[PDB]
Symmetry: D2
Subunit: 244 residues, 4 copies
Amino acid sequence: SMLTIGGKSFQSRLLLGTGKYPSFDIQKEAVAVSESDILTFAVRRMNIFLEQLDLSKYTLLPNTAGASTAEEAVRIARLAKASGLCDMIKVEVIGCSRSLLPDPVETLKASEQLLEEGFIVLPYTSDDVVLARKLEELGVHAIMPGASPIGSGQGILNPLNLSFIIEQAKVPVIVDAGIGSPKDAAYAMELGADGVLLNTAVSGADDPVKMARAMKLAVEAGRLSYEAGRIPLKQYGTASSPGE
Amino acid sequence: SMLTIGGKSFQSRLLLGTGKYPSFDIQKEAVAVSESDILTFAVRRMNIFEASQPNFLEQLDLSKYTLLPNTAGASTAEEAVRIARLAKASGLCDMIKVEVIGCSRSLLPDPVETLKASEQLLEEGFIVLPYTSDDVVLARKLEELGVHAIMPGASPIGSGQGILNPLNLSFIIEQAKVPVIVDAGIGSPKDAAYAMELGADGVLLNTAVSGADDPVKMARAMKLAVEAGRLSYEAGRIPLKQYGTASSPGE
Amino acid sequence: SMLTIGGKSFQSRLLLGTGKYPSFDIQKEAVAVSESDILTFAVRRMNIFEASQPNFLEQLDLSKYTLLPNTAGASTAEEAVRIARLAKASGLCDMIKVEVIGCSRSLLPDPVETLKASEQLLEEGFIVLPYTSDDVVLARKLEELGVHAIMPGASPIGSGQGILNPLNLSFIIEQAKVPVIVDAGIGSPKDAAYAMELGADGVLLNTAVSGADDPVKMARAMKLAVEAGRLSYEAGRIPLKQYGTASSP
Amino acid sequence: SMLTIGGKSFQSRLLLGTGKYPSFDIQKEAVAVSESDILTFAVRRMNIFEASQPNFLEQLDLSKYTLLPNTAGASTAEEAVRIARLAKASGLCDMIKVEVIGCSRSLLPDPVETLKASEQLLEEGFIVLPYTSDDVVLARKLEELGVHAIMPGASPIGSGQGILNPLNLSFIIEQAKVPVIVDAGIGSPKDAAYAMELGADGVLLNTAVSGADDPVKMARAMKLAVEAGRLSYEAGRIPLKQYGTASSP
């Protein structure tokens, strides 16, 4: 089924970040060739606290990057909404300055509060399997487990956990950041994810426009493969596969 | 600079295998949506070798593609040469894929026989593309014979495991003076994209597509994956963040 | 160095589970050859409940071990606390392993219930060691409650997969202010050794030893593996050579 | 069983290189604590090849070990044969490790020259052990020449990455009719243990030990790792649990 969040459907399963591109011209070009329908951005890092873009053609997913506690995240979200730049909110509460991995307690807390306030909520979380279900039980509109640490470029580090999260989900699962190249974006969709959220892997490339194109194709390719029923892994029964 | 083998250029970097699809209609549609320019097939298992088996490449306009018949079935260089000669005599050979399997369990290639068959076929005027392992120096040895491309396998034929040794593949691509096309052992788009991301000039696929529940859709998936991986390669992907933890000896 | 938890030291950094061995004779021999000083056991499945279940500690001279009863079987913090109280009242509790599984399929831990149970048991005077996931910040949240050790799993219980996310484990061990012991998901010596090579203070295993065709021999192997891994960590292993290939962006 | 090569038995399954230690004193104690019975060394780089070069075997009591000189440095089969002959004339050769590197960047072996050198040395009466890649059929071609052991690399020499293709190594070990010893590329105990867990008859290492901050302690760690891995192989480890997720097609 077409990616649907909070009752709204999207033709593109690729969520694109904005803000760290070399220039607005390159950013606008990248956004276009990506064909993304949902654009995400760090609210804090903006004048109100992305130009040359007709926001009327996109759904805005501002995030609370910079927040250390649920309270700071709620403050940022309320401002985004009041500023008219929020169709849905990406709850992001980083709890480690070194790894930049999310704080589960604060994410759980902020998600519950923002749901009570009427927001369409999408929490950025780790690949902790039960935690993901806990977030869903609050009533969030999507769950966004990270493939790996933000900006690591390592791709998905724990396919097994991601598989558990996707298979138990009752709302869309979108792999968020930690992506480095098309192979990672494709793998996420191959595992059954409903979409992928990318930012630095594209804006940080030597040629952002080309990479944005590559990611668009990779997400499509991975989704098609998932739907097509790929071949299984051949069983050889050697020592490298204990129990086989 | 698109894929160029033996002086001929190809718009598509995806080489598609034919012959094991559920039907000729599905195969035709798969070939079309893949946009592949080079079609590969095991000639030994076709009507031309014996009229007890249907022929592949059916319903296909052979004039719109470059044919890469392979010597699957050969156990020795001599058997490979026999197959190649017959394929050429039958008008189904533009280039030959030298495949000499030396293990019935893993289906991995025999290096000695592959080197032998490759040298012989080059002497006979063929455009030669050897299927080989990811043994780095072996790849250079093959190039030194004068082959027109080197086709290291990502993993064993039909394993569906993708690239098992990206480091070795990286060494092979970085030292090559002719195109490098990752051949089989591919299971999904992520693997095809990765090959291109490492710098491969192309990917050769068969069972991954023909064996999927929906071959036509997977054919389209692989086409997109190869294009995506190649684009990423050209675009200069971001590096890996260095955290300096014990999981990375040397930070 | 020497493993120290709650101020108590142990010569062996290998923690061993009891209760699932083929027999008590084998369990006794496996425990002995392992040289482990800390034994864990699921109180919920023992005789100290309603119906007479087996006494997993039968034939063992308990004066030779520090007891770490666990709350396996608990679905909520409340049930975990009750199990811990039971172990304490039965005189079989030196420290408590808090385990609250939240997924019947993966058997992965419930972070909310684990946080809750840990805080409650600390309030009740126990030396607390929570079993947790490899969620990095979660590990710190547990430490910040005042627990005496953190026990992140290498992979799901009984998976035999070994360490699935060494990076996350590395962050957990490097930020920790209490001992970090990799718990379960271990399949063979290579995994136990890796855990120690990453800087873990110890490893806790159960079925990888009890479920092997030769439990006693595997106990010996794990003993040697944990020792080897630790020595390597201390010896300063060689770095990864960099070739500058596309496979290393 | 016991590691047997050319009819000769060895108590230790750990083969150790010499000549790259911080000092001969450290080398001696490292070799001692490793309990290795077979020592390898690069003849082309020591005194017997050029008086201007030192003797990597100083202070060692060679009568306590079986000598496995290697042809490291040889770029062709001819050079390898020459090095082997020298080692023999110097009375420093019980078995010969054939090593013909064909890439200066990766240091990976030349299959053609290795095949050629092995054949020639066998003809000249040597007990031959070729260093090779993890090319599965290549390993068998070498065996079929009549060699006494096959030594596939886990990864490139000095890479410290451990075993990069366990599947291929598994095929090599399962098809072999002679001992298979994983040679170099090893970085820590987890790798040595894994090699044995896959069923290797032994492991050969050098810089992972000689290059550690504490070579003596690392030598001990590797001794324990090889023992642990072997014990696990024999003990019958637990299988990999299957969850039937998309991550396992």
